[PDB]
Design a protein around this ligand. Sequence first.
Ligand SMILES: Cc1cc2nc3c(=O)[nH]c(=O)nc-3n(C[C@H](O)[C@H](O)[C@H](O)COP(=O)(O)OP(=O)(O)OC[C@H]3O[C@@H](n4cnc5c(N)ncnc54)[C@H](O)[C@@H]3O)c2cc1C
Ligand SMILES: Cc1cc2nc3c(=O)[nH]c(=O)nc-3n(C[C@H](O)[C@H](O)[C@H](O)COP(=O)(O)OP(=O)(O)OC[C@H]3O[C@@H](n4cnc5c(N)ncnc54)[C@H](O)[C@@H]3O)c2cc1C
Lengths: 602, 602
Amino acid sequence: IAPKETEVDVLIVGAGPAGVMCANALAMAGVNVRIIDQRPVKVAAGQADGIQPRTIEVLQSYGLAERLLREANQMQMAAFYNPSPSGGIERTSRAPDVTAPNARWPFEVTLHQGAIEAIFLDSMKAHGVAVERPIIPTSLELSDSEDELRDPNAHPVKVTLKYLDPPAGQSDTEIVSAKFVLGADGAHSWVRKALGITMDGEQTDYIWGVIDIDPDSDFPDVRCKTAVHSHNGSCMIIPREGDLIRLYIQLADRDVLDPATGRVDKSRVSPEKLLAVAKESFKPFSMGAKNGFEWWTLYIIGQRVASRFSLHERVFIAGDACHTHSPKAGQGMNASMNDTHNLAWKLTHVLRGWADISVLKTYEFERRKYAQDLIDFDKKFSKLFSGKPRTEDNQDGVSHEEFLEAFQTFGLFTSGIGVHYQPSAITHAKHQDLASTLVIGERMVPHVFVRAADARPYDIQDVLPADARFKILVFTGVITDPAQAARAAALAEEMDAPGSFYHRFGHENPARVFDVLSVSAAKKEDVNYTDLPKFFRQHWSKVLLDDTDLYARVGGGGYERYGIDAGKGAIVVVRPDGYVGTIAPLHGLRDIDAYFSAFMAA
Amino acid sequence: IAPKETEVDVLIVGAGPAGVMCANALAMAGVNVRIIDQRPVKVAAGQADGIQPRTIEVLQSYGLAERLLREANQMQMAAFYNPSPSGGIERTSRAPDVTAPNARWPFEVTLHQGAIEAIFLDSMKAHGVAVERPIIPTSLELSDSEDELRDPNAHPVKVTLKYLDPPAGQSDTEIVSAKFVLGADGAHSWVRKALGITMDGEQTDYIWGVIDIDPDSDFPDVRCKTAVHSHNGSCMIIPREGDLIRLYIQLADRDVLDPATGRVDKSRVSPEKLLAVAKESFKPFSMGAKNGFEWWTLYIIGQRVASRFSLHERVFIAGDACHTHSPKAGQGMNASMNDTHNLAWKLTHVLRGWADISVLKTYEFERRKYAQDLIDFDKKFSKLFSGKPRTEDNQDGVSHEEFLEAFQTFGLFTSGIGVHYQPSAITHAKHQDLASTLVIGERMVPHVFVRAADARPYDIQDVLPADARFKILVFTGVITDPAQAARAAALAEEMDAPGSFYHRFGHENPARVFDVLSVSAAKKEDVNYTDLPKFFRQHWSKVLLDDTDLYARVGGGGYERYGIDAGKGAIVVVRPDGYVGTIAPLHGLRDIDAYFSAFMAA
Ligand SMILES: Cc1cc2nc3c(=O)[nH]c(=O)nc-3n(C[C@H](O)[C@H](O)[C@H](O)COP(=O)(O)OP(=O)(O)OC[C@H]3O[C@@H](n4cnc5c(N)ncnc54)[C@H](O)[C@@H]3O)c2cc1C
Ligand SMILES: Cc1cc2nc3c(=O)[nH]c(=O)nc-3n(C[C@H](O)[C@H](O)[C@H](O)COP(=O)(O)OP(=O)(O)OC[C@H]3O[C@@H](n4cnc5c(N)ncnc54)[C@H](O)[C@@H]3O)c2cc1C
């Protein structure tokens, strides 16, 4: 039965978090994408379960946060229990789970991986895309021809797929010719191995017992992230959806090795035993399960980074396939999902012919560095963050000053807000002076503005969706001053003139590429939406004001917050993934032109 | 051939706003409900456009506001245009659409009737209830037998239905025997007529042209609720979903009368003509349609109230079937929807055997009075609110002080928040002193509290859903003070004692009837959820604190806001529809017992 031969723009191998983020993003952008998985059915329970503040913001950009917040538990508060004068544990302190006053949502949310995936899968289905399964790649061939590798319309990747459960009569093999392929196939990536890419770092894997239960407990902080150190041992509570909690229990090599044949034997440790360890650690508080185990595993996990995150910018890897993090690093699946949020808009642009293929180099540049920074920080500084109290002079060989700086950095890693991309084609660190708070290469900073047309308030993030468009935020200054109004009008002419970047890169319909917004430093009492130049109000909703809502509950103070001189203004470019790409003065359109020129095709 | 004969607990005639609110509420409470409509398919458009603040709160109580707010346009801002000294219209003032600083959502939202209904219909379908259509009543019989009329398990209403388009094979006639029937069949209610109930009030009907368009206009306030008086006549903009607006245009008797034979000829008014009138009224601004009419009608509307809103508390009427309001009164379908939000929990309780049938008398008492109050206010004071500016000394024969008081009252009518039910079996106006802000008979006042267990903040309204339960809010005072802690414990034993109201009226599972919550006047630093008596923490989430969220963004100041002495505390009872039913001191449980005793069956 001859093998079937097909093409596709993007093939994704693996339908975990990274996979579904990517598939959804591509589907919502109307890209021709397929996604496969070797598992006959979707994961139902457990695994990754924490979502970070920045990741919530990202899901918001896709319209998916609403559902997450409706279904998920809020991990708002963390608590620390430690050995007591009397024996077993007492509470020493509590703190916000998240230390990040920028954050729109300054907490984590928890929910089982099955349910997180569902948010993406349901969105995918609505946009015409379904996981095909069970299927595995058996072979991956890639073109020698440099001309083919650099041609974004060639299909140089040939992936041979085997159907593990084909309809009777039909072939078990499909040979897919793809323009781009992504390996989102987890820590044991078949794709990574096939590409001949190493995983560099410590060879030590660590072992964690994990049980999800419905707790029978008088423990007061059962709904907090709780670090428990007892005479008997450590564990940690992650509160989950409803009344459920997860208990992580650190285990030893000893607990899992075979006294005879010295092999890793996971059957030595049962959930019953894990729970018995917890019971002891929680004394004098009770801890049992109301109804056995919702889920359990022995999680074996090391920290490593792939030596490369793409081959020829035609096959990529993402998530655990190219970097893994310990549970104590607090990353779960968050960096994995932000990898493909970074990748997809870039793939999208290349396929639409809007961006030169070289823009995809920025994926590895940005995301691989971040992964290394996480693990470099964990190695240097993780000893500080077990949740035993700092008692001593210069404890763990670091001063108070150095501890505070590390706790700050750590908080920025776990929130997901710290991500600071280095200069590249899509990150031009110039004119930072003009909006010192809107750090270039970091995500656009939440603040509320108000529409001139209808006085409705919006966080700026809500006007920066993941719609595969760049956003040009034109901070016009005090638009009521005739001089600054004339300035605004001049800039609008300039941007809409035929040779400008907007039209030259706009492919006959520039508003599909570039979303232009005004943000004027005046109040609604003095500005109607029609007062702005047409180019700054392409729709009536594009006219924002630095002003409060009608009941003075939100808004105002935006120019001050962002560090923008209200008398001069600035142009702030935000990428489709919501990161600030560059800044320029109102007279500095030529620098915006240079920005897009470094990666967009005419 | 032979007509089909069926039974049902509740039959609803009409699937408009009032109808679907009722059907959904009953479905969510697991009541056996059927609902019919004579329209072959669901409407795409209609009268309803505007949802008031209180109504949003109500949808929130069903979990339906989220979807409304996602789909609907926000009418945040109102504008007023009037004839200019020189000619043409000019803007005289702008203002918040809504005057209500309590309000959780201090604005109106707008959306087409089809889409509002959908929110309810999709919820209904998820709970196993579908509108049956097209069907009309042809006959309504009601029992003579007093014993049958007073028996909540008898079926004394016989409604004969005709199927306008029956499946082949089946009969075109069904005789439904119902326990309760509701007429939600509009201003020309067949049900009202059948019951022989008059509509009392002014005989004068007024005439309005209505057109929904996508405006081609340079009018600056096209996204505001705008009152426009021109030399040529008055009209009003209601902004709608997307770019759409609705224009209400006031007409004369002459515009629909025959210049010759003086007969009512409604064909003399076309949408084309209504738009031509708008064009003139907006001068010097432009106003045209981009693409014909989304919708239009001739709204003929008077203000009247049915002389009775039920017969024997077995057949009820609601919405336009028992009271109508002018467009300038600002009610749209909002009082209609709040009618059935009032009725359904009460029907529910009677059917579950939790309440005596006489409690249904409170429907007419509460909702008919509100309707009369609306129209009495409109007759006295509507001259003030055409949207013409106050230019003169003592204009319209009222002083500045009296004008301001009337504008305040009016704002409370249009917000929906002003509703103040008079004393009855379910409204005991006693101990008002102890929480002067929580007016008895008015809706529970929004304020944010924080859970002790996990520090998550919630508006109190979010802990008062429409789940057919009464809610007992026990404000415990300063729970950290030993004396007040002992007091709290004493009250908890009292409430959970075998002879108490809770058990005596709890029907073997009292938590299905009564939702008990704590609200302690202390901070999380000082109170874990386990510190409270068991009865005040039946679930860990029942323990609320008057404290801020972790970032001090919301919460605090609740006891002060409500007017409760933190040293003494109070019991506040909230009805299933979210209105405050009574208040009592912590030593006054006998008054709570008296409350429930006036209407609950043992
Ligand atoms: C048993 C188990 C326990 C875990 N416990 C925890 C925990 O306690 N805490 C925690 O934070 N994380 C845990 N995880 C891991 C968690 O899922 C990851 O840390 C995170 O989700 C990485 O996301 P990813 O997007 O890289 O893809 P993954 O979540 O790994 O998704 C990979 C997917 O690819 C599929 N796949 C693999 N190989 C192929 C192939 N050749 N062809 C096609 N499809 C393929 C798999 O079926 C899987 O569905 C656990 C994982 C497993 C398997
Ligand atoms: C054609 C039409 C146009 C309207 N246009 C406007 C407008 O432009 N602006 C405005 O402000 N208001 C308008 N209205 C009034 C509007 O219907 C209501 O004020 C509002 O939509 C909701 O109030 P309600 O829930 O009480 O009832 P309704 O919406 O009236 O719900 C009941 C509906 O069921 C149908 N029905 C009637 N008799 C029976 C029966 N015996 N059995 C079953 N179904 C029956 C009717 O079509 C009736 O409208 C219009 C009404 C109609 C019928």
